[PDB]
Amino acid sequence: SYNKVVLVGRLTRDPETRQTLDGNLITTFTLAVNRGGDDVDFIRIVAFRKLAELAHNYLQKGRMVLVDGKLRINKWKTNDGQPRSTVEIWADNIVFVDSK
Amino acid sequence: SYNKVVLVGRLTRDPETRQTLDGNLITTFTLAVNRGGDDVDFIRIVAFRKLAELAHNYLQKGRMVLVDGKLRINKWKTNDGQPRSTVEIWADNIVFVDSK
Amino acid sequence: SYNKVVLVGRLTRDPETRQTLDGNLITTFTLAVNRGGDDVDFIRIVAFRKLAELAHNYLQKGRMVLVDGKLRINKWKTNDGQPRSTVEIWADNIVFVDSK
Amino acid sequence: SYNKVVLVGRLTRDPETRQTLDGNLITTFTLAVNRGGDDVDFIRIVAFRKLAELAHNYLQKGRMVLVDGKLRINKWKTNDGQPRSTVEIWADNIVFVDSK
C-alpha cells in the first residue's frame, strides 16, 4: 500500500503538546487548508517524538506551514454502538515556508 | 493552500455510482490502505464526471489502484447538535497498477 | 504509470516567457531547492497556457513558491551523436506561500 | 525547501548494486514512466543502505513498482568545461504494486 499527504495551510491555534503516559511526546494542531473559493478543510495534524518537539518549539497560531505525512482514520464505537471516527495526518515532516 | 493525497490500496467493494439530482455523476468506493503491520485505514474515495464514469466501468472489489486527489472533511451537526464529519478523497486521477 | 513532483524553493531569476511559433505561451524559471545542509538542486520549471500567464504576472527572482507537476526528461543527440538531456518539471499548479 | 517525487513505472533492466569504496551499498535502476500517449521518460532511481539491499533482492527487469524520493541534479564539468548533469531520484521508499 502507499499513503502520502501533502498540505500547506495556517495553524488555527497554538499546538497542544502532551507526553502520553508511556513516555512519548505528541503534538497536535489543526491546519486551515482553503480549497481556493471560501470553503476550508480544518485537518488535525499529529507529530511524534522529535517532530512533536519541533512543532511545540516553532509553530504558533496563524503560521503558514507545509506538512507531509499519512492519512490515519481513528475509529471508535460509543457505549451505544454508534460509529465515530476521526481523521488525522501523522506528520513525517514539517517545513517552514515564511520567515517570522 | 495546497492539498494533495496519494494512495495505493485495494477496493473493499464494487464502486457505487449515482447521478445526484442536479445531473452530475458521483462514484464512491473505499480503499483498504495497510500501514505495513496488520493495521489498515479504509478511506472513502469520491470521483465526479468522467472520472466517475471510469471508476464505474473499470473498478471492482479487490482491485489494486492508485488514487490522487484532495482531502475533504464533510461536516454536519445532528438534530441534537452533536458534531459528525466524514472524510473523503476527491480523486483527481485513478491509475491502474496491475493487468486483470 | 504515475508521475508527480512537489517542490518548494525560491526562483533564482525572473521567469522568461515566450510564445513558441505555434501560438502557445511557455514560461520557464528555476527553483533553488535546498537539501537542508548547504547543497542545492536548481530545477527548471516549465508552465504552459494560463499557468504560463500566471508565472509571468506574479513570479519574480527570490520569491518562494510551491510547484507540483511531472518530471520530463528532454533528450537530444549532438551532431557528433553524444547524448545530452535536460530535466524539467511541467507544472500542473503554482501556489504562493508568502504575501509580498 | 521541499522536494518530493512519486513515480510508478516498470524497471527497464535488472538493478545494478555496488558497494562504493566507503562501505555503503548503492543500487540503481531505471523506471519507464509513460506520459499516457506513446512518449516515455526513463528516470534513474538510486537506493542506499537497506533500501539498496531490498531493490537488489526483489526488483527485476519489467517489474511495476512505486518509488517516492527526492529529485537530485548531479552536475559536472568536462575537461573542456562544457556542463553535463544527470537526474536521479534518491528513493525514500519502494512499494510493490503487483504479486509475481
Q: Annotate C3-68 with three-state secondary structure.
A: EEEEEEEEECCCCEEEEECCCEEEEEEEEEEECCCCCEEEEEEEEEHHHHHHHHHHCCCCCEEEEE
What residues of chain B lie within 8 A of the CB of C4, using their CB? 4, 6, 68
**Taking CB atoms and an 8 Å limit, are B66 and D8 in contact across chains?**
yes
Distance CA C94, CA C46 (A): 11
d(CA A89, CA B91): 18
Q: Which chains touch B (3 or more CB pairs under 8 A)?
A: A, C, D
Strand residue runs (E) in chain B = 2-11, 16-20, 24-34, 40-48, 64-77, 83-96
Q: How far is A100 from chain D (nearest CA, A)?
A: 16
Distance CA A87, CA A48 (A): 16
Residue C78: strand, helix, or coil: coil
- DSSP letter at A22? T
Q: What is the CA radius of gyration of chain B?
A: 14
Task: Answer yes or no: are the C-beta atoms of D15 and D29 closer than 8 Å.
Answer: yes
CB contact under 8 A, B66 and D97: yes
Grid cell listed for A97:
515556508
Question: How many other CB atoms sit within 10 Å of the CB of residue D52?
Answer: 22
Q: Count Cβ neighbours within 10 Å for each residue of B17-45 and write b for 16 or more, e otherwise.
A: beeeeeeebebbbbbebeeeeeebbebeb
User: What is the CA angle C60-C63-C68, rounded to 5?
Assistant: 100
What amino acid is encoded at B19 in this protein? Q
Taking a C-beta distance cutoff of 8 angstroms, is the pair B54, B40 a contact? no
Instruction: Residue D1: list chain A partners with CB under 8 A.
Output: 95
Cα gap A44→D47, rounded to integer Å: 33
Name beta bridge partners: C72: C88
Nearest CA in chain A to C6: A6
What is d(CA B64, CA B9) in angstroms, rounded to the nearest whole number? 5
Q: If you measure CA to CA, which chain D residue comes closest to C84?
A: D84
Cβ C97–A66 below 8 Å, yes or no?
yes
Question: Nearest by CB to A1, which of B1, B3, B8?
Answer: B8
* Closest Cα in chain A to C9: A97
- Resolution in angstroms comes to 2.3
Residue type, C43: I
In terms of CA atoms, which chain C residue is nearest residue D9?
Answer: C1
D49 φ, ψ (degrees, to nearest 5): 45, -130
Q: Do C33 and D66 touch (CB under 8 A)?
A: no
Q: How many angstroms separate the CA atoms of D97 and D100, rounded?
A: 10
| Residue in C2, C44, C90 to test binding to D, most D beta-carbons within 10 Å | C2
Subunits in contact with chain D (3 or more CB pairs closer than 8 Å): A, B, C
